Amino acid sequence: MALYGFAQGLIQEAGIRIKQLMEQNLNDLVTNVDKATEDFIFDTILETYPNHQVLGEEGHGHDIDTSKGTVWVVDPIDGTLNFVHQQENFAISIGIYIDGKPYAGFVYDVMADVLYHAKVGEGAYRGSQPLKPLNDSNLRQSIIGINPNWLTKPILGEIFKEIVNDSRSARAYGSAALEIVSVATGNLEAYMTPRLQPWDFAGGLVILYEVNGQASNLLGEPLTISGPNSILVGNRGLHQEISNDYLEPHHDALIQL
Amino acid sequence: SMALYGFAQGLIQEAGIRIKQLMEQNLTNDLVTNVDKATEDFIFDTILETYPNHQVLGEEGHGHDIDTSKGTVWVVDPIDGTLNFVHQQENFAISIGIYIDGKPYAGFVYDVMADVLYHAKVGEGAYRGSQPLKPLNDSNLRQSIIGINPNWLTKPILGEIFKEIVNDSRSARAYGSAALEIVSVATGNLEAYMTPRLQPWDFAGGLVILYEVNGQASNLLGEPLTISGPNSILVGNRGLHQEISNDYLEPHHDALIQLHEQRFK
Amino acid sequence: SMALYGFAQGLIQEAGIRIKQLMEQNLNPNDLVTNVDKATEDFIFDTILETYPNHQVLGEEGHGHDIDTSKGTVWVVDPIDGTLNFVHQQENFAISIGIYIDGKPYAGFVYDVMADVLYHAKVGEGAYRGSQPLKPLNDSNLRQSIIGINPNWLTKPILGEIFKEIVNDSRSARAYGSAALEIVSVATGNLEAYMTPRLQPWDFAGGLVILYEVNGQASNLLGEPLTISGPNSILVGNRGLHQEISNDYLEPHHDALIQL
Amino acid sequence: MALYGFAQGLIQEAGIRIKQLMEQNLTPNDLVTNVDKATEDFIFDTILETYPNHQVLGEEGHGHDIDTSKGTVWVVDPIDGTLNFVHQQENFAISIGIYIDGKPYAGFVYDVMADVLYHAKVGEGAYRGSQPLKPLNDSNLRQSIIGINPNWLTKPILGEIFKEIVNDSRSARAYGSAALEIVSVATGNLEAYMTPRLQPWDFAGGLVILYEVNGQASNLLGEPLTISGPNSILVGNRGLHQEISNDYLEPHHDALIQLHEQRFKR
């Protein structure tokens, strides 16, 4: 219980620190702020909990057997390009796991000052408001998040062609944690990418699970924090439609990758 | 001088509250149809009253066959981004452009849920609320972020042209309200935005805002946008605009013209 | 029907941008405010008159001092309510506009120029802070109420004694230097009441409509209705404490008060 | 400068916790009460956890009995403006002043709902967010706007003294957060501010800021304000501070001494 309180406090403080850094005005910046903020999160975690492991975008973590003890998986800036170009629409993602099992997840939209957070088996929240469980949708009646940049790619362009076609429309926001959360809130019916690192899904994942969401990789396998993977989330009915209807006919090509 | 601009400004704002009343009421997707219709009727009726001499070109079936070149013309989309409205209950905008004698005069795009109004008058600056907007600077495609629905890279002939540009861009986004995507360029939030098909009521408001920040608009053939009919759209900071149109679009002028004639009539 | 309401809303926002434009271009503090005030009224007045040449304008700066205010559409405007604030703080001042049709309230607007916040309502249609509806007021006891009243009124012959009780008794007091915003403070629930012995139509006309929409109550200090006929005293609050201040704090000074 | 940033970060984090607690309640003088306790406890615990040899003097009872001239002392008010918090849900401020060996060092007051942080380190100027504040110019009382709660004008003897100066001034305002009001003097929004009673937690932050833009502060008897006790307050730009003190207050020295003793002895 104190763990959760400590982490929320941390992520908020991480927030203040990023906004402080964005002056500055009084591309090198993004990577500095990324390094500075991860050092801060990693340093604060060890200062109260030196038995915990931090798996970080900035090169903290390191073969960490992610199955043992308490593990923080953090991206102080999920949405690097948004940050450089829009100065907004990025998030700190933190997911906390214990004994290889998810415990809490936070994704915090720094500039909008919205924190999405969830504890396992206790519901998902936008600030103080509960998120409602997702309902099944039909793909044709569904909005999917997917970056236009993935359709340009050699193979893969072909494998996503159908799913973009039948879906109702498509969006792309450029921060994987927030898109994952967007599904949790029902603002997208599905989101997918061929490659994501665990620090960009660990937070989002736990939140989605609380609203009855559904996570896999493009081949239907479970997602774990042991490595990068492809992404297909969520909403039972429609995850089931995308995978195996549009996806298992490309089972072969996916596996080269 | 400012009377009409002032009037449009307050009208769109009121239209915003009413849309939110209608959403708030619903609990007490036929909803989107009804709210679209109710919003346009409100907007239409209110113009009719102060300005019986104007014409309304509307998304919802007002002004179907009118001559946009004659007199003053409000070109309105009560809900630009219907899909976002149904699914996300946000990220949609009332869009209004006003033209006189065929030429741009004033634009408004109102992000209803943010309560944020972007607006401009020709020659007079663009605005976010009452904050002036600030002119754009050139960006290179290679260091640019561009709005373009994924769907379009899926189409015959068009899809291939679009992915040279996507390939080459720094990355791509898509938000689902043309009018907001245009403002995003107006804003520096996006460096360019493209689509092969948009209606006048969807670029008319945003276009005036974009031009006031020294931005640039054209169809995919590089021809000026007018309200006389639907079109393709390229908007961006100047050149970047030049770059897309000139290295990526122009070498397919003939194919794109074919596409343009196959689409419009 | 919202046509005129819309026109007013846009106009007040536009008048606001012009105010800030005049302020930013100082590339004398009393001269600035006097210029801005004139130019600003002129600007509202011109714009009303070219869509509505039959409407009348009652302005702080001297438009319509000759008029019957109870005939047709009458706009009652103060381009800078809070002039001292404008000079001394460059903020906390409002454009106030109230519209009347045939002597009855129609729409009110107060626009806090520097905060970019516009309070507005049309009779029967609710009050709003931007796009946000204001909640209806609840009654409060005076002992638990914060009231707005300038300290200056306490220093004055006859006046000091008549307000003494009301300030001793209420929970605490505030003063902001703009009657139109203070009336809006009562409508938003930031103050429970506000009072002043003297004020012009252009300063309460906007606020009054906003406040009437949240079910507040306005009179002069003698409990008489408030018109745009001319200057009057003001007491505004939620119903209950307006009833409390009027009845057992203000009526015992009925005599007196009546000057003038 | 590490202690300065630490304090800057902490005060802001404190604001997040207050807003968070406010937001929850939308799902009760008891609100202000719990929030006051919670925020001070957060502030206090965070200070001691990094600097255990420091001391905290606090509105909520931390450090009752403290030699404020010894070592590093934080003087904090989590909600300056409890009435405004209860009634307006805004116009309140966290106030932190930091002193080392009884000398001022740093002052923070943070308008939580406006997200505007007023700060100053000693000898480094005052700031509203990241904009520097200009030194104050002298003004006459006649061309001045002073801050003063209407309630003081009705107090036996004090009323008559204050009436003289309100009457004479251009006009009066009253905002109901002394910390914010002191800062209003620092930004030139009010030429002057006065009140017969304040606690150190409410002026300690303000004073540093005021001091950086050249204002001066004293109590109603012209004595200097320290953090060792509550006091009455007069702050303003130099000129009219001298004018109000020497012309309107001073001729009632004896009356004011009596009031001061009645209120603050022993």
XYZ file of N, CA and C in Angstrom, chain B residues 141-249:
327
model
N 10.862 18.414 -44.588
C 10.091 17.167 -44.448
C 10.785 16.193 -43.515
N 12.112 16.075 -43.679
C 12.909 15.104 -42.907
C 12.860 15.355 -41.401
N 12.558 16.596 -41.024
C 12.411 16.965 -39.617
C 10.985 17.410 -39.355
N 10.035 16.815 -40.067
C 8.651 17.205 -39.944
C 7.713 16.075 -39.520
N 6.611 16.467 -38.912
C 5.572 15.549 -38.521
C 4.333 15.976 -39.257
N 3.666 14.988 -39.860
C 2.604 15.249 -40.833
C 1.358 14.480 -40.500
N 0.212 15.112 -40.729
C -1.068 14.486 -40.458
C -1.551 13.804 -41.718
N -1.904 12.538 -41.616
C -2.454 11.846 -42.746
C -3.041 10.572 -42.236
N -4.338 10.389 -42.463
C -4.983 9.143 -42.118
C -4.291 7.941 -42.748
N -4.066 6.899 -41.954
C -3.538 5.677 -42.508
C -4.308 5.188 -43.727
N -5.629 5.185 -43.661
C -6.450 4.696 -44.770
C -5.955 5.028 -46.170
N -5.513 6.264 -46.341
C -5.145 6.733 -47.644
C -3.907 6.015 -48.204
N -2.979 5.509 -47.383
C -1.805 4.824 -47.991
C -2.197 3.440 -48.521
N -3.477 3.149 -48.379
C -4.064 1.891 -48.747
C -4.702 1.902 -50.148
N -4.894 3.097 -50.704
C -5.626 3.287 -51.964
C -4.805 3.086 -53.261
N -5.494 2.799 -54.397
C -4.771 2.655 -55.670
C -4.132 3.966 -56.167
N -2.870 3.887 -56.594
C -2.097 5.037 -57.145
C -1.738 6.128 -56.111
N -2.750 6.625 -55.416
C -2.592 7.572 -54.304
C -1.706 7.049 -53.146
N -2.007 5.839 -52.684
C -1.285 5.228 -51.590
C 0.209 5.163 -51.799
N 0.647 4.993 -53.038
C 2.064 4.845 -53.324
C 2.784 6.195 -53.264
N 2.124 7.219 -53.796
C 2.644 8.575 -53.750
C 2.753 9.051 -52.309
N 1.824 8.611 -51.469
C 1.739 9.128 -50.126
C 2.802 8.553 -49.229
N 3.193 7.315 -49.515
C 4.207 6.687 -48.705
C 5.626 7.057 -49.060
N 5.877 7.702 -50.196
C 7.221 8.305 -50.376
C 7.375 9.370 -49.314
N 6.303 10.149 -49.152
C 6.294 11.316 -48.307
C 6.244 10.900 -46.848
N 5.447 9.891 -46.541
C 5.443 9.359 -45.204
C 6.818 8.773 -44.874
N 7.297 7.845 -45.698
C 8.645 7.271 -45.557
C 9.648 8.281 -45.094
N 9.552 9.432 -45.718
C 10.598 10.374 -45.672
C 10.435 11.318 -44.505
N 9.182 11.554 -44.134
C 8.832 12.424 -43.026
C 9.441 11.834 -41.753
N 9.506 12.642 -40.701
C 10.027 12.179 -39.428
C 9.052 11.231 -38.729
N 7.757 11.454 -38.922
C 6.734 10.549 -38.428
C 5.410 11.127 -38.841
N 4.339 10.404 -38.506
C 2.979 10.694 -38.986
C 1.940 10.575 -37.877
N 0.896 11.395 -37.962
C -0.191 11.382 -37.008
C -1.511 11.502 -37.747
N -2.598 11.210 -37.038
C -3.914 11.402 -37.578
C -4.878 11.518 -36.418
N -5.672 12.582 -36.403
C -6.541 12.929 -35.269
C -8.044 12.831 -35.521
N -8.455 12.962 -36.789
C -9.838 12.677 -37.214
C -10.813 13.850 -37.340
N -10.302 15.082 -37.226
C -11.106 16.269 -37.537
C -10.304 17.194 -38.446
N -10.596 17.168 -39.751
C -9.798 17.965 -40.694
C -9.592 19.390 -40.191
N -10.663 19.982 -39.664
C -10.589 21.383 -39.216
C -9.569 21.560 -38.065
N -9.549 20.603 -37.121
C -8.542 20.645 -36.061
C -7.101 20.327 -36.595
N -6.999 19.428 -37.579
C -5.693 19.106 -38.118
C -5.092 20.321 -38.834
N -5.965 21.161 -39.403
C -5.527 22.370 -40.082
C -5.096 23.384 -39.045
N -5.911 23.572 -38.031
C -5.451 24.418 -36.941
C -4.101 23.938 -36.379
N -3.875 22.630 -36.331
C -2.629 22.096 -35.749
C -1.425 22.566 -36.524
N -1.624 22.722 -37.824
C -0.600 23.313 -38.654
C -0.545 24.802 -38.324
N -1.706 25.427 -38.157
C -1.753 26.847 -37.787
C -0.934 27.122 -36.504
N -0.718 26.052 -35.742
C -0.306 26.109 -34.358
C 1.156 25.640 -34.147
N 1.742 24.976 -35.148
C 3.054 24.362 -34.998
C 2.969 22.952 -34.427
N 1.761 22.511 -34.085
C 1.512 21.174 -33.545
C 1.765 20.111 -34.608
N 1.479 20.479 -35.852
C 1.812 19.685 -37.009
C 2.607 20.549 -38.026
N 3.557 19.953 -38.733
C 4.203 20.735 -39.798
C 3.432 20.691 -41.130
N 2.757 19.580 -41.440
C 1.889 19.540 -42.611
C 0.668 18.668 -42.395
N -0.347 18.875 -43.241
C -1.482 18.009 -43.269
C -1.978 17.789 -44.692
N -2.366 16.539 -45.005
C -2.822 16.126 -46.355
C -3.998 15.184 -46.349
N -4.790 15.255 -47.402
C -5.868 14.303 -47.594
C -6.365 14.536 -49.002
N -6.792 13.468 -49.669
C -7.214 13.555 -51.045
C -8.673 13.988 -51.256
N -9.406 14.246 -50.178
C -10.839 14.550 -50.261
C -11.357 15.247 -49.002
N -11.776 16.482 -49.172
C -12.352 17.207 -48.087
C -13.431 18.132 -48.646
N -14.440 18.418 -47.841
C -15.494 19.326 -48.240
C -15.145 20.748 -47.824
N -15.696 21.744 -48.532
C -15.480 23.140 -48.181
C -15.753 23.448 -46.715
N -16.849 22.932 -46.155
C -17.197 23.246 -44.753
C -16.169 22.723 -43.764
N -15.228 21.953 -44.270
C -14.225 21.371 -43.428
C -12.876 22.045 -43.473
N -12.617 22.849 -44.500
C -11.360 23.577 -44.555
C -11.544 25.062 -44.512
N -12.788 25.522 -44.630
C -13.064 26.963 -44.798
C -12.685 27.792 -43.588
N -13.130 27.366 -42.409
C -12.763 28.000 -41.145
C -11.254 27.969 -40.985
N -10.689 26.754 -40.992
C -9.282 26.497 -40.692
C -8.304 27.182 -41.618
N -8.689 27.252 -42.886
C -7.908 27.879 -43.931
C -7.606 29.344 -43.652
N -8.603 30.050 -43.111
C -8.433 31.485 -42.808
C -7.430 31.700 -41.659
N -7.533 30.820 -40.668
C -6.607 30.765 -39.546
C -5.171 30.453 -39.990
N -5.031 29.494 -40.897
C -3.762 29.020 -41.389
C -3.084 30.135 -42.152
N -3.852 30.780 -43.017
C -3.299 31.844 -43.820
C -2.883 33.016 -42.962
N -3.613 33.277 -41.882
C -3.196 34.395 -41.044
C -1.891 34.137 -40.296
N -1.469 32.880 -40.193
C -0.183 32.639 -39.528
C 0.904 32.422 -40.537
N 0.631 32.859 -41.768
C 1.611 32.871 -42.859
C 1.858 31.480 -43.435
N 0.922 30.580 -43.141
C 0.912 29.224 -43.652
C 0.551 29.136 -45.116
N 0.310 27.916 -45.567
C 0.073 27.681 -46.973
C -0.810 26.519 -47.309
N -1.758 26.768 -48.208
C -2.743 25.760 -48.577
C -2.870 25.613 -50.071
N -3.149 24.385 -50.495
C -3.377 24.057 -51.886
C -3.973 22.666 -51.958
N -4.521 22.334 -53.118
C -4.902 20.961 -53.406
C -3.651 20.196 -53.838
N -3.773 18.892 -54.082
C -2.592 18.058 -54.299
C -1.950 18.395 -55.639
N -2.654 19.183 -56.454
C -2.129 19.632 -57.749
C -1.495 21.021 -57.605
N -1.567 21.586 -56.405
C -0.980 22.892 -56.133
C -1.857 24.071 -56.535
N -3.141 23.800 -56.730
C -4.097 24.808 -57.134
C -4.768 25.436 -55.916
N -5.108 26.732 -55.987
C -5.682 27.345 -54.784
C -7.011 26.690 -54.360
N -7.233 26.591 -53.048
C -8.501 26.119 -52.517
C -9.630 27.175 -52.602
N -10.799 26.757 -53.080
C -11.951 27.647 -53.065
C -13.177 26.914 -52.489
N -14.217 27.657 -52.144
C -15.396 27.016 -51.556
C -16.400 26.525 -52.597
N -16.066 26.698 -53.871
C -16.974 26.283 -54.929
C -17.166 24.755 -55.020
N -16.340 23.999 -54.306
C -16.378 22.536 -54.402
C -15.321 21.822 -53.574
N -15.560 20.529 -53.275
C -14.653 19.635 -52.519
C -13.277 19.546 -53.172
N -12.257 19.104 -52.432
C -10.936 19.086 -53.017
C -9.963 18.209 -52.268
N -8.786 18.008 -52.848
C -7.658 17.491 -52.080
C -6.993 18.681 -51.358
N -6.158 18.360 -50.376
C -5.640 19.336 -49.442
C -4.237 18.923 -49.130
N -3.349 19.906 -49.259
C -2.017 19.939 -48.706
C -1.969 21.279 -47.985
N -1.663 21.250 -46.688
C -1.319 22.444 -45.963
C -0.047 22.245 -45.162
N 0.751 23.297 -45.035
C 1.954 23.210 -44.233
C 2.547 24.581 -44.022
N 3.540 24.696 -43.139
C 4.365 25.894 -43.180
C 4.802 26.023 -44.635
N 5.065 27.250 -45.081
C 5.480 27.503 -46.480
C 6.688 26.684 -46.829
N 6.691 26.043 -47.982
C 7.929 25.355 -48.377
C 8.490 24.444 -47.284
N 8.417 23.153 -47.578
C 7.839 22.104 -46.725
C 6.532 21.825 -47.424
N 5.696 22.859 -47.520
C 4.637 22.853 -48.511
C 5.288 22.740 -49.888
N 6.169 23.696 -50.226
C 6.927 23.692 -51.499
C 7.589 22.324 -51.642
N 8.247 21.838 -50.581
C 8.968 20.561 -50.627
C 8.061 19.376 -50.963
N 6.962 19.211 -50.232
C 6.051 18.120 -50.536
C 5.516 18.233 -51.967
N 4.908 19.378 -52.323
C 4.263 19.567 -53.623
C 5.290 19.350 -54.706
N 6.505 19.849 -54.497
C 7.540 19.857 -55.541
C 8.480 18.667 -55.760
N 8.859 17.948 -54.700
C 9.689 16.753 -54.881
C 8.835 15.487 -54.887
N 7.682 15.534 -54.226
C 6.893 14.326 -53.973
C 5.563 14.213 -54.740
N 4.927 15.346 -55.000
C 3.647 15.352 -55.705
C 3.774 15.655 -57.192
